[PDB]
């Protein structure tokens, strides 16, 4: 959610 969902989109982008 917090960093999990955040970092997820980071590397994904």
Print the SS3 string covering the chain: CCHHHHHHHHHHC
Q: Technique behind this structure?
A: NMR
Q: Enter the tokens of residue 2.
A: 């917090």
User: How far apart (Å, rounded) are the C-alpha atoms in residues 7 and 2?
Assistant: 8
Buried b (16+ CB within 10 A) or exposed e, 2-12: eeeeeeeeeee
Q: Is 9 helix (H, G, I), strand (E, B) or coil?
A: helix
Going from the C-alpha of 5 to that of each of 8, 13, the distances in angstroms are 5, 12
């Amino acid at each position: 959610a917090a960093a999990x969902a955040r970092a997820a989109r980071a590397a994904r982008a």
